[PDB]
RNA sequence: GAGU
DNA sequence: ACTTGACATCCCACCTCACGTATGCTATAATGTGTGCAGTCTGACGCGG
């Protein structure tokens, strides 16, 4: 399932898509919710397979990916992308010395998530 | 890392059909073993002891399994981690039992790293162990004879054989299995027979206990002709595609057809064959089909 | 001198001798590494050179090598084996002339070895004639099998030429698997000499040789009669036989007792023979640490019982008797070294004195006026050995501190606690002390 | 060998290595993985902060332990600051965004 | 053809980053004519310098800043260094006697006055005046000014031309960008008249609706021209002769600079070779080479063809010297003044000899003997002699540790002691509470206890209410009663520390 | 500063000005005798902060009374030493230099933005050939290589309109002038009429780069570095070994060379040095800069005085011995002990033998708290003195703390989660840890001198998680298969 | 040089 | 309880001194060179060409 993390877009939403873009399966379903309910033009998708290393490097957690391999490369790509890491995953919090969003740390982490909605 | 139980049930109907693995020689891992503690998606029907039906969305506990064992259902759609609807993570239901605890997994537990540790662990162990305890090297490669254990009918699925002079039922198909039917018609035992294997009893006839029904020499896969006549040589020249090994005495030899490595630069595309011609000369055709029998001997075919 | 001392000190091949026991030293000296300049590293070494070659026969022990990433790279020289003229490996072999086994030995290199047909030592030999069997057991051109007597050119000197020095000491290697064989040779290298040396019950004949060559034992170089015996001096009167008409015939061997090995282990010599004993050239006068009268005394031998106990012997764990401590067997002497350094900072030159601010006079009591521990005093971890004072510099009186300094006084003398502490949880006796004063400053009382 | 408190590392401000320095054991990524398998977040956080590079945090938690509190109250591990500054040395801007 | 060979070798350059190769290639094309070729360009140096000096004699402001800057330092009683040492240092075709200065400046003023009288009569330079102006310029050629002073005089003219061109640029910026006027017509009218206003309204006389639009901001346009005209007035140079001087001077300067370019690039090989001798593992090859080039710069500029001797010989020392001084100062992390460096050098040369005489080593005493320096000083130098060893140094022979994995921060007061200091402050306030309100505040303030600041006796007295000496007695009373074990039960333990 | 997210982008040169507090003009670190920081040097107090807490350079001003005090004579601010981990400095680079990372690392964003191969850029940068920025003349437009005398054959005939230059500064210029907005639209229009397959694939890639670039708001001119940020001194500290000797970071040696060469460039500029040597210096500048960021990426690297390659910023982050894996995702930890395992047949499933001296040390602070609360010791100082002597009383207090405390046992390698388990520790004489036989299978431990680590979860929460979730008795079944791990052997 |  | 004045000890700041430091100048002629080790593995995804 982790290896199925990414898909390929045919057809524009309201967002930063277009032909052949390799975007996360999660961002596709988020677009689904918001666009189907409101309307706008639809986007056709197809699922893609990435093995291990590539899949890891593709995930939207660049400190995760930077901790894995190809530190140099991943940093540059994210730097050019102006990428913003929202810090939902594990090792992110690990490194920051925070509460892991798993298990015992579930409570605190969901509290911050609701605090995002409240301004 | 990111895979965690966020939801109890997103409400997916999708799922993967798990079988009892009858890979060749036996049923190495059964359905019970593969499915225990999993949530099911959908109900499976089979003509059985009384027309089996089994309610869905249900986690199959040990005892559920026992009941379904008596019914003998073969294929089960089970709700999978993959077929999960949940974003960034999975459902309690789609995962199932947390094996270490015995119960349903706890929402929030990091199942991802769970899986990883379990799967990395043994690899790391199964290297170290037979490397510092097994001070030598060997493998069970006496894949000599098949032997039917209990008295039942012989029934074959997927092959097309051609009867010879000595009288063996020689198999020329890559898709061959040799199964065992019991009293009232089921697939009990299963064997895997490769290309070129001599058979004894074909289709329909009963085998008594522990009788030799199949046979083949291990270290040598023969290619066996379906039709008769004189061997005609095509593109097997010496040095380009074959190597002369000849002695004195009455002047006997054994040709070795070498693969890509030993071939000179000119004999790259030359596909060596043995063409089936008759007493008259002309391509005798395999019975009922159009092929002029040209058996492509592979790399290093002695 | 730079490039030389580069080689000697910094190079890979120059290492601290392992002196755990004489075996360790001897084995180390003859071990052979595939690394170094013009040679391989850990990644650079594949299966190629690590794996076990038929050529290693009688030249390197196939069975002596460090486990782990070093494996395959470093290997001990086999017993009888030496380097030829060109630094190639060679093994001595017996000639066999027309069926009969001659007495001549020739050293052959690997290249030379490939050529000829060699019988094993194990092959059965008719008393000063030929071979006992008509179809005999030998190897030619690197390959083993059956040959007849007339075809056989040469033969192994003894079985032990196959194996290194370490491996040769193991008694019933014949019945032991190679994995554990390997571990066996390795462990022998780490054995420590106890207080009381015991000769091994089960040896191989090699245990005399090993000790002999280790050279840490003292050996009689003339022979004659022992004139004076001391636990420090062994003096022998030579026979007029070996006596030089030039000099005098008295040979003096000063022994060394309890010196420190690189491993912190014991290096002590005991005199073997008695005053007025007549002894021969090459007799063992004084034994090194793990050595009995001529023999390697690696460890000690106990009555073992093979049985499962109430899980005290669980998984290779060992159950043992208080009687072992009662007899003081397996008690190690460790001579540990510590250094006290009096440096000069620009904060002021540090000094060694008995002068130690806010210490218990328990710690002061054992020190001389120089600040040096007394000879022979027994102390414990944390206890002060050598006194030292260092330049301080305070004046950071945060408010509260000033208050109390005023009230009670206790006027602060600037000095850190540089004084020489003993290591954690460690307790033994001071066996000796050394003092090196630099030329500039004047002599210390104790010095 | 064992260590509660002793000399720390110069750059990272982590405990040193070896009996020679009174050093602490490295609790490695392996060990991390173990904690992660359990849901044990606070133990992990201990290892990451109060036990290592968080100065204010370790000192505060020490005092809390004596006082019989056992509250954690974490700080920022020095290693992470090491990280930030080295990235900015490479001319790469990394800012930690406020909510 | 030389450039063609460069480019064929450049087509093969297989990404060889080694700058050694690159430099070697370029220099490899440039040949070196010797003997007289060198002196050729040296002559160009001399004539460039004299060019600008001719201008100084001829130009009004130039002589002004001379006498004007003589008075600044000389008038104030009797001065001989600073500004005077920067100037003068003259060669008549060194300790400067007052007698000669009085004399050499005397003939200048008379010349000045006579050279002025003719200017006025009839024309600017009517025939005779042109001949006497030329003779005036030939008088000034005789002097050479020291480089430092020469710069600032050259600078006044350089930036003046900037002002000219920049003022026109700013004027034409607003004029051409906001208004609009063809620059070809500009040529004739501006070169002819300049000073008078005829060209202003004559330009508008060509008619065409745009010329008439101009009155709404008429005041601004021509008044801005006044700034430019005022530059004319204050400069006091007529545009017929103004151009002549400025551009001709520009020419002299360019000649000299480009000439040196040729010279320096011709001598590359020399620098490099001499550098590679001291390349001997001190810094890097290239760094050295750069330093050597700096030495050649120096050689070029102080080189005199008059010496009659080979260039290589002279330049060699300047380049050699640059390299030596640079290693001494750069090189090590611990920067060292050269006095110390030279002493180190002595040390090691002697070390060799002494090891060979003794058969062993040199003890500080024996060493100190042969140098006739104080042993303490020797030992100091020996210690200071240690070079930076790397913090990143793999201490682990097995790549275990980067030295850093040892280093502990003794600055850090241990959490043990930090707990101690906390308990202490808390304890202090609680015993403070035992004291009488104002007595408590007395000691609280006196030592800054629980306040960001410490007040000493007098300042406490001020804040209290007069009483200074009574505070001594209060201090003593606190002392006395706090010596009592009652209040001091808590404080008692700390006496051990 | 309680945060939501982390964003990464190109550092602007003026943003680098912002973080940097002062310019490091001198390569010097400190004075050789008085090891105080030098003026505008690498360890400068005026820039990076004071050496010692709340005390300025010249030493007139000390104490907390002065905070934010700015010493008039020396220009030293009075504050915490800690600042030397966080103030950045900077260098003014005379020649705008390209960032190595965006060149030599694949794909190389510069190369892909300009659709220009590596070699071209190299020859340009290394001053081997000139290149055309802006061609009024139709003959040549963007990105044309000109040699030495091709540039002359070009200049002589044309010029005026014809714009070309050499090096990283030229590339910087071509970066500013290329049209961000227009080209994106151009490409999609190109797509609208005709799309042969592979051409459309590369054109697609490029479109992605460009759009992502202008959405993020990163400016291409930032590829060229004008300002070079300089790492805080504590991160590249300079320390004496006790023998008088020194250790310095490799960063310091690379940085020093950077400054040396940059200052020489200032001299060469003021002297109006000939083109050849100016070019050579720009090569050298580029080298030093790129060596500092990532050494050896560029080919033959700068070595140690030893032989060993100098360790660059990149190595510091990236390497397995880099900051990530060695110091961030894992570290050394306190309140842990390690020693040999010995059999404990008598121990219960949830128990373990804990050696006297080990536990004494471990549980130090717990000891002190109870010592003071029970009043057995007057204060914490006396409690320490009382621990270091070691009377009967000490052991009893240890007993009470260890009572109902769970402690963690760890064996490397952490094969699975049960490589660490929680136990109730029971004190024993000796230095050996006792392990329960049953759990040997999970640790894959055997008694032939294996060692284990013993960590202490300190908080109530840690204790809870250890006893509840990690306890031996709680975890018998393998998470791997459903079956037992803790079993007969 | 330990063990997995 | 507090002040005053006398007499006696301690703390802060500015001046002459002496060593330490920064930079210049040298003239037979000297002018295209340094330099090493890296490697061997090994399947790998990737672009370039
Ligand atoms: Mg073990
Ligand atoms: Zn100051």
């Amino acid at each position: 399932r982790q290896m199925l993390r990414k898909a390929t877009i045919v057809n524009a939403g309201s967002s930063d898509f277009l032909e052949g873009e390799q975007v996360e399966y999660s961002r596709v379903k988020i677009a689904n919710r918001e666009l189907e309910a409101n309307g706008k033009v639809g986007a056709t998708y197809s699922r893609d397979l990435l093995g291990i290393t590539k899949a890891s490097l593709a995930t939207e957690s660049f400190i995760s990916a930077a901790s894995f391999q190809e530190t140099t490369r991943v940093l540059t790509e994210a730097a050019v992308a102006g990428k913003r890491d929202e810090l939902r995953g594990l090792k992110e919090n690990v490194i920051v010395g925070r509460l892991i969003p798993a298990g015992t740390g579930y409570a605190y982490h969901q509290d911050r998530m609701r605090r995002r909605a409240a301004g | 890392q990111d895979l965690v139980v966020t939801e109890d049930d997103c409400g997916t109907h999708e799922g993967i059909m798990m079988t009892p693995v009858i890979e060749g020689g036996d049923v190495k891992e059964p359905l019970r073993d593969r499915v225990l503690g999993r949530v099911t998606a959908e109900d499976v029907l089979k003509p059985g002891t009384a027309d089996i039906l089994v309610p869905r969305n249900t986690l199959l506990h040990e005892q559920w399994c026992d009941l379904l064992e008596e019914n003998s259902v073969d294929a089960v759609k089970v709700r999978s981690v993959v077929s999960c609807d949940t974003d960034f993570g999975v459902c309690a239901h789609c995962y199932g039992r947390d094996l270490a605890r015995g119960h349903i997994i706890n929402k929030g537990e990091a199942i991802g790293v769970i899986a990883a540790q379990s799967i990395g662990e043994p690899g790391t162990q199964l290297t170290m162990r037979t490397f510092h305890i097994g001070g030598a090297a060997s493998r069970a490669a006496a894949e000599s004879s098949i032997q039917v254990k209990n008295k039942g009918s012989i029934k074959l699925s997927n092959v097309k054989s051609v009867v010879n002079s000595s009288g063996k039922l020689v198999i020329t198909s890559r898709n061959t299995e040799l199964k065992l039917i019991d009293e009232f018609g089921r697939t009990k035992e299963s064997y895997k027979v490769p290309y070129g294997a001599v058979l004894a009893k074909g289709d329909g006839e009963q085998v008594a206990g522990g009788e030799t029904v199949a046979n083949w020499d291990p270290h040598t896969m023969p290619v066996i002709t379906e039709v008769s006549g004189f061997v005609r040589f095509t593109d097997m020249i010496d040095g380009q595609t074959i190597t002369r090994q000849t002695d004195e005495l009455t002047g006997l030899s054994s040709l070795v057809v070498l693969d890509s490595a030993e071939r000179t630069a000119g004999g790259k595309d030359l596909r060596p064959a043995l063409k089936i011609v008759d007493a008259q000369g002309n391509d005798v055709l395999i019975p009922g089909t159009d092929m002029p029998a040209q058996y492509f001997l592979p790399g290093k075919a002695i | 001198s730079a490039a030389v001392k580069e080689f000697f000190g910094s190079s890979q091949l120059s290492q601290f001798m392992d002196q755990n026991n004489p075996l360790s030293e001897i084995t180390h000296k003859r071990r052979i590494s595939a690394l170094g300049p013009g040679g391989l590293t850990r990644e650079r070494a594949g299966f190629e050179v690590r794996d076990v070659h038929p050529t290693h026969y009688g030249r390197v022990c196939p069975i002596e090598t460090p486990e782990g990433p070093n494996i395959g790279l470093i290997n001990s020289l086999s017993v009888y084996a030496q380097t030829n003229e060109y630094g190639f490996l060679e093994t001595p072999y017996r000639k066999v002339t027309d069926g009969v086994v001659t007495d001549e030995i020739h050293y052959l290199s690997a290249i030379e070895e490939g050529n000829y047909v060699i019988a094993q030592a194990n092959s059965n030999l008719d008393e000063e004639g030929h071979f006992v069997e008509d179809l005999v057991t030998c190897r030619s051109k690197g390959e083993s099998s059956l040959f007849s007597r007339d075809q056989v050119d040469y033969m192994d000197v003894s079985t032990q030429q196959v194996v290194s020095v370490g491996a040769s000491l193991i008694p019933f290697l014949e019945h032991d698997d190679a994995n554990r064989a390997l571990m066996g040779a390795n462990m022998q290298r780490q054995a420590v000499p106890t207080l009381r040396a015991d000769k091994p019950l089960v040896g191989t004949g090699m245990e005399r040789a090993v000790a002999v060559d280790s050279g840490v034992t003292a050996v009689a170089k003339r022979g004659g009669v022992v004139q004076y015996v001391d636990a420090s001096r062994i003096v022998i009167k030579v026979n007029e036989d070996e006596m030089y008409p030039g000099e005098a015939g008295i040979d003096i061997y000063n022994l060394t007792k309890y010196t420190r090995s690189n491993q912190n282990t014991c290096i002590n010599q005991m005199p073997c023979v008695s005053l007025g004993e007549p002894v021969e050239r090459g007799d063992v006068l004084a034994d090194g640490p793990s050595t009995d009268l001529g023999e390697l005394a690696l460890g000690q031998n106990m009555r073992v019982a093979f049985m499962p106990w109430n899980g005290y012997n669980f998984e290779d764990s060992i159950l043992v008797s208080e009687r072992v401590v009662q007899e003081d067997r397996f008690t190690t002497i460790h001579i540990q070294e510590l250094a006290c350094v009096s440096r000069d900072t620009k904060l002021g030159p540090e000094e060694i004195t008995a002068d130690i601010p806010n210490v218990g006079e328990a710690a002061l009591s054992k020190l001389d006026e120089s600040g040096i521990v007394y000879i022979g005093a027994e102390v414990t971890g944390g206890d002060i050995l050598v006194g030292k004072v260092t330049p301080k510099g305070e004046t950071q009186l945060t408010p509260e501190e000033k208050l109390l300094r005023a009230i009670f006084g206790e006027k602060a003398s600037d000095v850190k606690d540089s004084s020489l502490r003993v290591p954690n949880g460690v307790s033994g006796t001071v066996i000796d002390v050394q003092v090196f004063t630099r030329d500039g400053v004047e002599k210390d009382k104790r010095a | 060998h064992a260590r509660s408190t002793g000399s720390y590392s110069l750059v990272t401000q982590q405990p040193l290595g070896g009996k020679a320095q009174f050093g602490g054991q490295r609790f490695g990524e392996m060990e991390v993985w173990a904690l992660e398998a359990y849901g044990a977040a606070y133990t992990l956080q201990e290892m990451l902060t109060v036990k290592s590079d968080d100065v204010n945090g370790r000192t505060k938690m020490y005092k809390n332990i004596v006082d019989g509190n056992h509250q954690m109250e974490p700080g920022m591990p020095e290693s992470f600051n090491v990280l930030l500054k080295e990235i900015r040395s490479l001319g790469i801007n990394i800012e930690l965004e406020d909510e | 053809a030389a450039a063609q060979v460069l480019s064929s070798v450049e087509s093969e350059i297989g990404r060889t980053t080694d700058p050694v190769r690159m430099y070697m290639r370029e220099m490899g094309t440039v040949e070196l004519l010797t003997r007289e070729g060198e002196i050729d360009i040296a002559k160009r140096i001399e004539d460039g310098i004299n060019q600008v000096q001719c201008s100084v004699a001829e130009y009004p402001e130039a002589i002004t800043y001379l006498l004007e800057q003589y008075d600044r330092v000389e008038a104030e009683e009797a001065r001989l260094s600073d500004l005077i040492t920067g100037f003068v240092d003259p060669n008549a075709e060194n300790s400067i006697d007052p007698e000669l200065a009085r004399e050499k400046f005397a003939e200048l003023r008379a010349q000045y006055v006579v050279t002025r009288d003719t200017i006025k009569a009839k024309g600017r330079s009517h025939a005779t005046a042109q001949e006497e102006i030329l003779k005036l310029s030939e008088v000034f050629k005789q002097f050479r000014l020291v480089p430092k002073q020469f710069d600032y005089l050259v600078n006044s003219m350089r930036v003046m031309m900037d002002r000219v061109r920049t003022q026109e640029r700013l004027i034409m910026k607003l004029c051409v960008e906001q208004c609009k006027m063809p620059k070809k017509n500009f040529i004739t009218l501006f070169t002819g008249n300049e000073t008078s206003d005829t060209w202003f309204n004559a330009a508008i006389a060509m008619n065409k609706p745009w010329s008439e639009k101009l009155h709404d901001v008429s005041e601004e346009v021509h008044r801005a021209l006044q700034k430019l005209q005022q530059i004319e007035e204050e400069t006091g140079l007529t545009i017929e002769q103004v151009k002549d001087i400025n551009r001709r001077m520009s020419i002299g300067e360019a000649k000299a600079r480009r000439a040196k370019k040729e010279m320096v690039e011709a001598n590359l090989r020399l620098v490099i070779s001499i550098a590679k001798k001291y390349t001997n593992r001190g810094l890097q090859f290239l760094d050295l080479i750069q330093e050597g080039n700096i030495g050649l710069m120096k050689a070029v500029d102080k080189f005199e063809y008059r010496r009659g001797y080979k260039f290589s010989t002279y330049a060699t020392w300047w380049i050699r010297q640059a390299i030596t001084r640079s290693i001494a100062d750069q090189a090590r992390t611990i920067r060292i003044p050269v006095h110390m460096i030279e002493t180190i050098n002595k040390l090691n040369r002697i070390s060799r000899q002494m090891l060979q005489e003794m058969g062993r080593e040199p003890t500080p005493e024996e060493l100190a003997e042969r140098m006739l320096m104080p042993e303490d000083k020797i030992r100091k130098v020996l210690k200071i002699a240690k070079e930076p060893i790397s913090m990143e140094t793999p201490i682990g022979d097995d790549e275990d540790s980067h030295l850093g994995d040892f280093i502990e921060d003794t600055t850090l007061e241990l959490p043990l002691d930090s707990a101690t200091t906390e308990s202490l402050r808390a304890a202090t306030h609680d015993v403070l509470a035992g004291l009488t309100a104002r007595e408590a505040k007395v000691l609280r303030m006196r030592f800054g206890i629980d306040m960001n600041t410490d007040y000493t006796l007098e300042e406490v007295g001020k804040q209290f209410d007069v009483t200074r000496e009574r505070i001594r007695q209060i201090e003593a009373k606190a002392l006395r009663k706090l010596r009592h074990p009652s209040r001091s039960e808590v404080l008692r333990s700390f006496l051990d520390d | 500063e309680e945060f939501d997210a982390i964003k990464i982008a190109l550092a602007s040169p003026d943003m680098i000005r912002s973080w940097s507090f002062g310019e490091v003009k001198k390569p010097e670190t400190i004075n050789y005798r008085t090891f105080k920081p030098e003026r505008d040097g690498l360890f400068c107090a005026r820039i990076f902060g004071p050496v010692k807490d709340y005390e300025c350079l010249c030493g007139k001003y000390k104490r907390l009374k002065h905070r934010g005090v700015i010493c008039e004579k020396c220009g030293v601010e009075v504050t915490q030493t800690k600042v030397r981990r966080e103030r950045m400095g900077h260098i003014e680079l005379a020649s705008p230099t390209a960032h190595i990372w965006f060149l030599k690392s694949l794909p190389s964003r510069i190369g892909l933005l300009l659709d220009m191969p590596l070699r071209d850029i190299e020859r340009v940068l290394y001053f081997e050939s000139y290149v055309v920025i802006e061609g009024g003349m139709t003959n040549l437009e963007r990105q044309q290589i000109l040699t030495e005398e091709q540039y002359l054959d070009a200049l002589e005939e044309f010029g005026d309109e014809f714009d070309a230059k050499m090096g990283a500064e030229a590339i910087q210029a071509l970066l500013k002038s290329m049209d961000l907005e227009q080209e994106c639209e151009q490409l999609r229009e190109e797509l609208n009429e005709t799309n042969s397959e592979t051409k459309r694939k590369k054109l697609t890639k490029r479109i992605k780069l460009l759009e992502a670039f202008v959405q993020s708001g990163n400016k291409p001119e930032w590829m060229i570095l004008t300002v070079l940020p300089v790492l805080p001194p504590d991160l590249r500290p300079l320390v004496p070994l006790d023998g008088g000797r020194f250790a310095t970071s490799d960063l310091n040696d690379l940085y020093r060379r950077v400054i040396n060469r940059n200052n020489r460039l200032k001299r060469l500029l003021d002297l109006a040095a000939p083109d050849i040597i100016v070019r050579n210096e720009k090569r050298m500048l580029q080298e030093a800069v790129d060596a500092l960021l990532d050494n050896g990426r560029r080919g033959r690297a700068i070595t140690g005085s030893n032989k060993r390659p100098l360790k660059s910023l990149a190595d510091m982050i990236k390497g397995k011995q880099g900051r990530f894996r060695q110091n961030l995702l894992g570290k050394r930890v306190d309140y842990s002990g390690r020693s040999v395992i010995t059999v404990g047949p008598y121990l219960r499933l949830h128990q373990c033998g804990l050696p006297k001296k080990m536990a004494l040390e471990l549980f130090k602070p717990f000891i002190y708290g109870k010592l003071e609360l029970r009043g057995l010791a007057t204060t914490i100082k006396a409690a320490k003195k009382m621990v270091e002597r070691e009377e009967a009383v000490v052991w009893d207090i240890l007993d009470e703390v260890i009572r109902e405390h769970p402690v963690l046992l760890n064996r490397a390698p952490t094969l699975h989660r049960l490589g660490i388990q929680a136990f109730e520790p029971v004190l024993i004489e000796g230095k050996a840890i006792q392990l329960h036989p049953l759990v040997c299978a999970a640790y894959n431990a055997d008694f032939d001198g294996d060692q284990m680590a013993v960590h202490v979860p300190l908080t109530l929460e840690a204790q809870l998680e250890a006893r509840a979730l990690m306890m031996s008795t709680n975890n018998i079944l393998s998470p791997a298969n459903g079956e037992p791990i803790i079993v007969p052997s």
Side-chain angles (χ1 to χ4, degrees), chain E residues 141-157:
Chain E
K141 255 197 193 182
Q142 182 212 345
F143 301 103
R144 300 284 298 276
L145 276 183
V146 166
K148 282 286 157 60
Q149 293 304 349
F150 199 73
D151 284 5
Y152 193 77
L153 311 174
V154 164
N155 291 332
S156 314
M157 299 163 292

Side-chain angles (χ1 to χ4, degrees), chain F residues 341 411 444-451:
Chain F
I341 64 145
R411 187 203 207 303
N444 211 343
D446 49 6
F447 304 97
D448 40 21
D450 301 352
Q451 322 185 7

Side-chain angles (χ1 to χ4, degrees), chain B residues 148 150-156 169 178-182 199-209 211 213:
Chain B
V148 165
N150 278 10
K151 193 155 192 158
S153 186
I154 297 276
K155 228 164 202 165
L156 316 168
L169 205 92
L178 176 73
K179 296 181 186 206
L180 202 89
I181 287 265
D182 29 32
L199 272 178
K201 308 242 160 184
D203 168 25
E205 302 196 24
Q206 311 276 337
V207 291
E211 178 178 289
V213 290

Side-chain angles (χ1 to χ4, degrees), chain A residues 1-2 5 29 89-91 103, chain B residues 1-3 85-86 88 108:
Chain A
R1 201 207 173 269
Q2 275 315 294
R5 189 143 218 194
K29 264 159 60 196
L90 320 176
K91 283 181 191 288
Chain B
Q1 89 152 23
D2 272 25
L3 216 88
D85 180 22
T86 319
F88 293 94

